[PDB]
Each structure stands twice: as C-alpha cells, then as structure tokens.
Design a protein around this ligand. Structure first.
Ligand SMILES: O=P(O)(O)OC[C@H]1O[C@H](OP(=O)(O)OP(=O)(O)O)[C@H](O)[C@@H]1O
Ligand SMILES: Cc1cc(C)c(N)c(C(=O)O)c1
Ligand SMILES: [Mg+2]
Ligand SMILES: [Mg+2]
Length: 338
C-alpha cells in the first residue's frame, strides 16, 4: 500500500480496497503521514463520498490507538450523546445537558467530547473535570453515573490529523470520527450528524458494530433532535438501518425558533445548563428533554412509541425531581475530591 495508490484510487472516484482506509489512517495516527498526505487523503475521501466500510476502517484504527478504559469498568449498556458538530448554528450544548439528564435518569453515560463553546468548554466552566484519564473516568462512571472522555486525552495520536483539520478548515470525512471513536466503546448512543448526506454512512458504521443508535439530523440542520421542525433519524437496531422522519409536536412539543436555542461563550452556556437543571421552562428545556429521551430510547434498543413515552417521562422526571441538578453537583464534587 502507498499514498500514490490510495490517493489515485480516490481521485479516480473509486471505493477503496478492504484495508486501504485502515492503512491510511494508521499511517496518519503513527506520525508517518506528511501533512500534505493527510490533507490529500481527507479531501479525496470526502469528495469521492466515503462508504460505511471505509469510515468503519478509519474509526477502528483510531480506537486501536486510543487509551482504553480499564477492563470491566464500562457497563454493557453505557450510552453516548455526541454530535459531529459543525452545524453552522451556534446552540447551547444540547448533548451535554441531555447526557447529564440521562445519567440522572439512571442510564450509565460515557460521553465523548471536545472543545469548540463546545461540550468540553461548558463542562469545564461548570466545574467538571474534563481532563481525566481512563482510571478516573471509570471511577467517575462508577461513582457519579457519568464519565466524560475528552477526545485529546484519549486519542493523543490524532494530533497530526487534528492539526491538518484546523489548517484546511473545510469539513471532511474526519468530522465524522468523534462520535464513532468513543474510547469506552459504548454500545448505545444518540448521535448527531450535521451533514445530512453522511448521516446514513455514520449509521452504517454503528450498524456494523451492532450498536443500538439513533443517528439524528434536525431538518433545520442541527446535529441534535431539534424542536424547531422535524428531524431525520437513522435508527440502528439489530445491525440494520431504518430511516424515518421524527416530529416532536407528536409528543406535545411546541415549535421553537432556532434563535431560542442559540448559545454564547462557556459562561453563558454554563448558565443555560444551570437554568435547565434548576427547572426553567421553555425552549432549551424542551430540546434537552427531547434529546435525553432519544438517548434513553437508544439505550432501550439494546433489547418505538412506548420507548419514546417512557424516555420523555424519565427525562422530565430526572430534571423535575432535582436528580439532574444534584447529579451535576455530585459530578463537580467528585472531581474536586481528586
Ligand atoms: O460545532 P463545533 O464547535 O465546530 O465542534 C464540534 C462539536 O461537536 C461536539 O458537540 P457535542 O454533541 O459533543 O456537545 P453539545 O451538543 O453539548 O455541544 C463538541 O462540542 C465539538 O466541539
Ligand atoms: C481527538 C483529538 C485529539 C487531539 C490530540 C486533538 N488535539 C484534537 C483537537 O485539537 O480537536 C482532537
Ligand atoms: Mg451535540
Ligand atoms: Mg450540537
């Protein structure tokens, strides 16, 4: 295998041969790939139109190189709530807030995340330790019900890819990898995809791993279940993908305006988390509850309408009883206690 060969095949608009994407990603992750080669590969893959097999190869290499969590520390039914980002709309950290609420409802959550105010920035501002290694994330999950895997901490060898991603700016296939590379390897997730054309490829990757996952794209372009309009959902169950249209109004949700979901810096976004967890009613709470419920449905799938009703009931109660607010406080506390 070589760069001229792989790049030539991609510029010929041809799907890669089995193992070629893995070879490329492994060259990238081991510091053996020049910045020019990384960029060429990222772009060529993107323009060819990556397949699930290919994206699955890239993600597997990343996971091979990632720091794992200690054996037997991650529950068999752990769930992630994470999006590709890059939806061009600046929202409150819907996934992060949903994760807190899901953990509070009793579903173990191991959230993969990163800076932008991104999930990681907002958590840091809330006083949550984002920087914890495998052992301590495992303890966090055991003692709090939620662990946060900070992408840079667990994927240090991604450094060269990350630099190139910054330099070129343009979204590429690499933008799909975060939600597919949680180092704790949870089997369930609510997975946001900004890129409508690539949501199905993401779903295909999760299906190949037999995850129970909802890949979601708001029909307003949010990488979350949206409240402003309907959402497209790629439902992954039993190793196959269903595409459907999801309408929140179907559960009594009032239509919001995207401006009402808008975020700010880490301090603003942190305030918005505190507000939701303190019971503030309105658009942000509604979107958080909806996404929390979707994550619970994905968790349920590890065994539709009944699932959503129970998910919504459970998410609402976790906030209303103060369990969500208390969980965050316990999370802050856990991290201050080293
Ligand atoms: O949108 P960008 O800033 O360009 O970067 C992509 C973001 O995707 C993640 O959202 P995640 O679902 O993990 O958290 P959230 O929905 O709570 O923000 C995380 O915040 C990354 O920064
Ligand atoms: C996954 C990951 C890993 C490393 C080492 C990074 N620096 C970044 C980043 O800057 O976004 C992301
Ligand atoms: Mg998100
Ligand atoms: Mg988002």
């Amino acid at each position: 295998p070589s760069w001229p060969q792989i790049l030539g095949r991609l510029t010929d608009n041809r799907d890669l041969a089995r193992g070629q994407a893995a070879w490329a990603m492994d060259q990238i992750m081991t510091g053996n790939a020049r910045p020019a080669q990384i960029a060429a590969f990222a772009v060529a893959m993107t323009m060819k139109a990556p397949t699930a097999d290919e994206v699955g190869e890239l993600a597997g290499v990343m996971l091979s190189h990632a720091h794992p969590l200690p054996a037997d520390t991650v529950p068999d039914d752990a769930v992630d709530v994470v999006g590709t980002g890059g939806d061009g709309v600046n929202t409150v950290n819907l996934s992060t807030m949903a994760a807190i609420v899901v953990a509070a409802a009793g579903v173990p959550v191991v959230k993969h995340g990163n800076r932008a105010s991104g999930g990681a920035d907002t958590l840091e501002a809330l006083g949550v330790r984002i920087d914890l290694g495998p052992d301590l994330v495992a303890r966090s999950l055991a003692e709090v019900g939620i662990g946060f895997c900070f992408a840079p901490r667990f994927h240090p060898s991604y450094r060269h890819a990350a630099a190139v991603r910054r330099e070129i700016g343009v979204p590429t296939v690499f933008n799909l990898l975060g939600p597919l590379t949680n180092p704790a390897r949870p089997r369930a997730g609510l997975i946001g995809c900004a890129f409508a054309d690539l949501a199905e490829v993401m779903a295909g990757v999760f299906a190949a791993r037999r995850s129970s996952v909802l890949v979601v794209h708001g029909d307003d372009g949010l990488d979350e279940l949206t409240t402003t309009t309907t959402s497209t959902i790629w439902r992954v169950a039993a190793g196959s993908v269903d595409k459907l249209t999801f309408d929140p109004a179907g559960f009594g949700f009032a239509r919001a305006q995207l401006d009402q979901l808008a975020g700010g810096d880490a301090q603003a976004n942190a305030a918005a988390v505190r507000a939701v967890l303190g019971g503030a009613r309105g658009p942000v709470r509604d979107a958080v509850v909806l996404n929390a419920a979707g994550a619970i449905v994905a968790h349920a799938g590890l065994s539709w309408l009944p699932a959503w009703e129970e998910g919504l009931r459970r998410a609402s109660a976790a906030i209303d009883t103060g369990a969500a607010e208390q969980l965050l406080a316990r999370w802050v506390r856990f991290g201050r206690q080293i």
